[PDB]
Amino acid sequence: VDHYNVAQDVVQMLTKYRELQDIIAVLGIDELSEEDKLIVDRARKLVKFLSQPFQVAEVFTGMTGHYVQLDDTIDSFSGLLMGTYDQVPEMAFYMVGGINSVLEKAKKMAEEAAELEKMRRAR
Amino acid sequence: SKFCAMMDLLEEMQHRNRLKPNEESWTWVMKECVKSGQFRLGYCIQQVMETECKGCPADLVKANEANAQKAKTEGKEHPGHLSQQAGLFDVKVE
């Protein structure tokens, strides 16, 4: 039942995202209400989060692949829908596998940007 | 269920064969309700007989009331699970 509910919610959010993409194409992004903005952000994360690195492409693309277990998939998408991961950057979901990958890539992004600040602050 | 079987037969007699049930027909229904112990059904049949027939047999009415009181004394007036209170997020919809 949880799997079915999560799948339907994702489909509903994606459909709403397409509708919101049409309004911003006319009214503008600033015209969306507070709820619509949150829906857009969550949907964009979902779209970025649906991409996976295949182990078969390790040689060509270099990046190590991921095999996401079903239990992880339901929990990872369920948490995103509720809004638990509303503070993670959008790009942390692009071509990553599982929720844990989203977090480690956030560490590597937060720590990476930390050096950039000490550089840009200095110099 | 005997009551459901008998009621269906009356429906066939009334609505398809176009024959009006007589007093004897309803007495058998009332007798089954008393015998089975379905006192709530007996109430409806009692009103049915009074409305259509020339009243209801007194003995059956008194027997039906006797069954209701025994349930009331024994706490069986309603199914148990119906009285258990539940909230919005506690109703275990199945």
Partner: protein
Amino acid sequence: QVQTIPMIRGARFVALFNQKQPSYFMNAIVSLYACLNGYLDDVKVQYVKFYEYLLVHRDLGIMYGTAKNKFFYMYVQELNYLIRFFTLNSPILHGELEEMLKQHTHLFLQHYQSKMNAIKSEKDVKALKNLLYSCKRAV
């Protein structure tokens, strides 16, 4: 958006037609009669299924100690053949039918819909959705 009486009842009827498993004759006809007489006007469209489930399976009149009927309770499954013989608009079954419907509607609006309208927590929102999905799939 002008919503007249026909529009409200029509929308509720469409919501009620959503089914998964066949419904017992008594449950289906009783719900249709309640919607037809305007008892679901105050009930929101998304909550119609939850309202129907409480009407069929549960019994709020017995729950909140406000029962006055003698025989017309939805747990008496033998009433199906009395509702099929006399019609719901009969002097025998019409009086009790209205009483239980009025009590059920009043209790539902007082207790359940009011709380459902005061849910903002994300966890509560998710819980409410799961409840609605379960109700839609079971009566």
